[PDB]
Amino acid sequence: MFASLIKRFQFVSVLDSNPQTKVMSLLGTIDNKDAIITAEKTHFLFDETDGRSTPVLYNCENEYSCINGIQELKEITSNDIYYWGLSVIKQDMESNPTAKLNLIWPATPIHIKKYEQQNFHLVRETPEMYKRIVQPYIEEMCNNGRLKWVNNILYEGAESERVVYKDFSEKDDGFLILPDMKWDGMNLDSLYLVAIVYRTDIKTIRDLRYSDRQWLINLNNKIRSIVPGCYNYAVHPDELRILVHYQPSYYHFNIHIVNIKHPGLGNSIAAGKAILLEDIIEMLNYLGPEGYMNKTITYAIGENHDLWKRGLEEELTKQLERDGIPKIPKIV
Amino acid sequence: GMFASLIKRFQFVSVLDSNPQTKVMSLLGTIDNKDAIITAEKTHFLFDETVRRPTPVLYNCENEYSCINGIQELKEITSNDIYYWGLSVIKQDMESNPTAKLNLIWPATPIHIKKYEQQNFHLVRETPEMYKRIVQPYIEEMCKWVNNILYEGAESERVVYKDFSEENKDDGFLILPDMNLDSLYLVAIVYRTDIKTIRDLRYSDRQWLINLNNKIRSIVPGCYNYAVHPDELRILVHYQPSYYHFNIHIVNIKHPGLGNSIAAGKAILLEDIIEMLNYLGPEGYMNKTITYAIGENHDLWKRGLEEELTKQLERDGIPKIPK
């Protein structure tokens, strides 16, 4: 299915290019419907290898590990103790693929606006701004469409072959953990999982009250007690960065689980987007009974985000004015 | 030739660094029993050297090796609703689409070996009691070059902004670069000397911090002719900080280079420090339990954070490998 759709993709324009991270997003069409492809070069590989078994960390004995797959070298130049050149390395679908590809199709305007390159703004969202600007947006943006994949995973067996943990009695307390769409699933250094809760009344951290703290504590404990054993303790419980996003892309409470060794894709682990789950728990001690409903939350938003023109832009200008920040002359 | 000959003789010793963000790998080894460093980096995808309309949205994908044109083989990972994702093999070629950059340092010096070593990190949960027992005595032992910059003119040629009036001898600061405007990275070092980390910020410091937030955003854009806006600066502090003298990092919100340096678990937004002081009571961050990523090379790791992390995991009922 995947292959068939990639083969029909017709290029329209380049949405974004990041040579630091080797990520690319493409706009196109499939059967005259908009489509988005995101590509990422793979990382280098390392050897995969009482009666306990310990993981061999960072070894280079196997055929495709490290630089064993070099077929061809070419020097660019050299001087003193330095040599600079280029290499071609043997690619192979099973053992050394060249790049990961994601496809969104049919892609919606929200998807295209998200992936187009755009300016970002550090916004300060007060409680009243949330009530006025964001909450009405959330209720609209709770389409059974923009969340169809979440329900697909929860109730229709989607990616069930990949699920790593599932805690469900028929109720609202259970959850499952599975590989994140971002993870290529081969390099443990980039391990990225998402925990999806079954309860539906928490759309964002704004909905977490003081009474939710013990439930959140339990999720933090379960994740760290389970995830390392799924990977033969190749990643330890203290090596998992467990976090939520505000604003999230999808308005259903989901928890991100990332190898501490991962310096991070985009904003997924960045201050201004990511908040540690441990921090969510601790902050509920100090906010009121209504919890994050009472917090003024400062975060990074893109100019293409629907909320920008829906009021965050106008409110950011007024916030800058109130803070005594100059209004930038038109002369520059 | 020579280069190829040296790479073939390289005998792997250990991995210095593996970075899945940048797709970089550094290997320590030997050649003729001398230390050598090899660095490999995946190449970026390629685009046409022409454009399809008078920034990356105008790139094109017409040439043989551009974009994903070289895909020979596809394999699905999974799919869900409108989302499909998988892996691909793409035609490689030395002249038009090489696979990776490959550099050699040989003989590499110990200075060379350092710099390339990336330490491993561990999430610790540092309570108020832990700071007083483990962290605070370490900071006191820490008695430096920072004072050379502040009071002896070091890097004065490089300073971007410096407070001078007696009025803010204490509440003032200076800003200088960290050693393309998208990659703007400045550090504000404050003139007060009693704040070594965020632990020392009290409620009474909230207004002082707000003013710093306002000064930074009012000054930096003008130093760059308003090419970056005040709301395009990611202004943050670190815990643990890189030096135990309070300082604020000022980063282009779009800086593409950065990884761990801006990550939750290390970086905290300045606005968040300000907001949290409304709730932490008079002593501020002294009362906070701070969960953050600590490095294995840090003195605090073997000084008590390791031992405390293992006990925390026991108390929380988390399985771990012992000893």
From Swiss-Prot, chain A:
Its post-translational modification remark reads:
Phosphorylated. Phosphorylation occurs upon glucose deprivation.
For this protein, the activity regulation entry reads: The hydrolytic product 7-methylguanosine diphosphate (m7GDP) efficiently inhibits the decapping scavenger activity and acts as a competitive inhibitor in vitro.
Q: Which residues carry this modification: Phosphotyrosine?
A: 58
Task: Pinpoint motif Histidine triad motif by residue range.
Answer: 252-256
Which residues are listed for substrate binding in this entry?
159, 182, 245-256
Q: What is known of its domains?
A: The C-terminal histidine triad (HIT) motif and the N-terminal domain are required for the decapping activity.
Xref: PANTHER family: HISTIDINE TRIAD HIT PROTEIN MEMBER, M7GPPPX DIPHOSPHATASE
Supply any other comment. Present with 9920 molecules/cell in log phase SD medium.
Known role: Decapping scavenger enzyme that catalyzes the cleavage of a residual cap structure following the degradation of mRNAs by the 3'->5' exosome-mediated mRNA decay pathway. Hydrolyzes cap analog structures like 7-methylguanosine nucleoside triphosphate (m7GpppG) and tri-methyl guanosine nucleoside triphosphate (m3(2,2,7)GpppG) with up to 10 nucleotide substrates (small capped oligoribonucleotides) and specifically releases 5'-phosphorylated RNA fragments and 7-methylguanosine monophosphate (m7GMP) or tri-methyl guanosine nucleoside monophosphate (m3(2,2,7)GMP), respectively.
Q: What is this protein called?
A: m7GpppX diphosphatase
Q: Which organism is it from?
A: Saccharomyces cerevisiae (strain ATCC 204508 / S288c) (Baker's yeast)
